[PDB]
Design a protein around this ligand. Sequence first.
Ligand SMILES: *[C@@H]1O[C@H](CO)[C@@H](O[C@@H]2O[C@H](CO)[C@@H](O)[C@H](O)[C@H]2NC(C)=O)[C@H](O[C@@H]2O[C@@H](C)[C@@H](O)[C@@H](O)[C@@H]2O)[C@H]1NC(C)=O
Ligand SMILES: *[C@@H]1O[C@H](CO)[C@@H](O[C@@H]2O[C@H](CO)[C@@H](O)[C@H](O)[C@H]2NC(C)=O)[C@H](O[C@@H]2O[C@@H](C)[C@@H](O)[C@@H](O)[C@@H]2O)[C@H]1NC(C)=O
Ligand SMILES: *[C@@H]1O[C@H](CO)[C@@H](O[C@@H]2O[C@H](CO)[C@@H](O)[C@H](O)[C@H]2NC(C)=O)[C@H](O)[C@H]1NC(C)=O
Ligand SMILES: *[C@@H]1O[C@H](CO)[C@@H](O)[C@H](O)[C@H]1NC(C)=O
Length: 257
Amino acid sequence: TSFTRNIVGRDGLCVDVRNGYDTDGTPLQLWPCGTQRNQRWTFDSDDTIRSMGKCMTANGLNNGSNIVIFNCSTAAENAIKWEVPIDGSIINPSSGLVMTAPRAASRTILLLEDNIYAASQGWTVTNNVKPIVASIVGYKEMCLQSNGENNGVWMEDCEATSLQQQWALYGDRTIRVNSTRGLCVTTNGYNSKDLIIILKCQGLPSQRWFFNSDGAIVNPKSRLVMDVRASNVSLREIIIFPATGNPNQQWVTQVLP
Ligand SMILES: *[C@@H]1O[C@H](CO)[C@@H](O[C@@H]2O[C@H](CO)[C@@H](O)[C@H](O)[C@H]2NC(C)=O)[C@H](O[C@@H]2O[C@@H](C)[C@@H](O)[C@@H](O)[C@@H]2O)[C@H]1NC(C)=O
Ligand SMILES: *[C@@H]1O[C@H](CO)[C@@H](O[C@@H]2O[C@H](CO)[C@@H](O)[C@H](O)[C@H]2NC(C)=O)[C@H](O[C@@H]2O[C@@H](C)[C@@H](O)[C@@H](O)[C@@H]2O)[C@H]1NC(C)=O
Ligand SMILES: *[C@@H]1O[C@H](CO)[C@@H](O[C@@H]2O[C@H](CO)[C@@H](O)[C@H](O)[C@H]2NC(C)=O)[C@H](O)[C@H]1NC(C)=O
Ligand SMILES: *[C@@H]1O[C@H](CO)[C@@H](O)[C@H](O)[C@H]1NC(C)=O
């Protein structure tokens, strides 16, 4: 069974076969998302991912290997299989390396690299090529809110008119300030009780998040989850902390009008 989507990643750019060429070996790159065929990827039940009738192919299975388009029947079988872990990676099972956008820029060429759970290794398979804009509702039904670059995020009463409560959920698995999309929700370290702040998006593992089935917002590198510190909204501190299932770690997205 097959279905076709765009693949959105770093900075909301899409996986794109360079210059629309279908020549074997043409690299994959980032490019602003659109409907062109070299950005439409068909996911088949054989774990191939195809554009223009050819396969996404690792041109080698080493750290730093380029990913290219290549004829599905003549490519090495190992090199054309991909899986899509629930946290938003795109992994080549043979090598265990993951598809990575090493720079934010358009025309950055995609590589297989060691998985470090970086936001540069986050992807979203979707027909909607725009970030989803939502409030993030958590403990006491309050809303997560940003408060400027380098400052903490924290909880406030939900307001339809508070733009700092509006989050752009980007395809690279970053959570960005909707009005200032260069800025990312960032853990300031990977240890329990490190503080969650807003920092310039830099593709880092500290800027990657996963909304899991238990209502947690998980930082995959650390394993830890967003937590309203001490269940005390007046502290105005959100930290990462091990998942406990407690109310101060439950979150819902609510789409904004
Ligand atoms: C896989 O390729 C990665 C990207 O080139 C390597 O990480 C890079 O290692 C550089 C040192 O050679 C270092 O200056 C870069 O900052 C770093 N880049 C990133 C995005 O992490 C990786 O190298 C290993 O991991 C890094 C973090 C260092 O610890 C290196 O000393 C390691 O060798 C490559 N993996 C391997 C096994 O070589
Ligand atoms: C992938 O490479 C295959 C092997 O070279 C191509 O199949 C070959 O296509 C030739 C010209 O199209 C044709 O003379 C050969 O009979 C055939 N060889 C084999 C082993 O099937 C293949 O081309 C696609 O498949 C063939 C059978 C035709 O349907 C073509 O029109 C197809 O494009 C290459 N696939 C692609 C997408 O280029
Ligand atoms: C989130 O931010 C985006 C990006 O700035 C806002 O989207 C813009 O909205 C204006 C007015 O509707 C449009 O003319 C632009 O086309 C939009 N730009 C983009 C890039 O989408 C959006 O209004 C903000 N708020 C919400 C709720 O999405
Ligand atoms: C909650 O945080 C505030 C602000 O620092 C503090 O005054 C208060 O005593 C804290 N503890 C509880 C139990 O609310």
